[PDB]
């Protein structure tokens, strides 16, 4: 029973680490893409404002 439990729990630990890294990378990509879009929007806003003035 201890071998069964150790095998199952080690597999579960590896899996859960996998989902944690999945979430880390996905949210990092989301955050950097959001920052890039924000910077682009700011640049476009400033360009349009100068052109309109």
């Amino acid at each position: 029973e201890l071998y069964q439990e150790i095998k199952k729990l080690q597999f579960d630990r590896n899996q859960e680490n996998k989902e944690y890294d999945n979430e880390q990378k996905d949210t990092n990509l989301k955050i950097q893409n959001l920052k890039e879009r924000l910077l682009y929007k700011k640049a476009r806003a400033q360009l349009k404002n100068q052109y309109k003035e």
Binding site: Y20, R37, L38, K41, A45, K48
Partner: protein
């Protein structure tokens, strides 16, 4: 670790969403003042 990192990163996500939304709102509003001031200048110049 999962819960704490996810909460912090989700919070940063709404922070970035609000940053982008505020950038758009400020660009639109500033265009608003620019157009309004140009029109007002038109009125005063025509009056004079």
């Amino acid at each position: 670790h999962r819960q704490k990192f996810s909460k912090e990163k989700k919070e940063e996500l709404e922070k970035l969403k609000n940053e982008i939304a505020e950038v758009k709102a400020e660009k639109e509003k500033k265009a608003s003042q620019l157009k309004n001031e140009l029109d007002n200048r038109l009125k005063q110049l025509e009056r004079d």
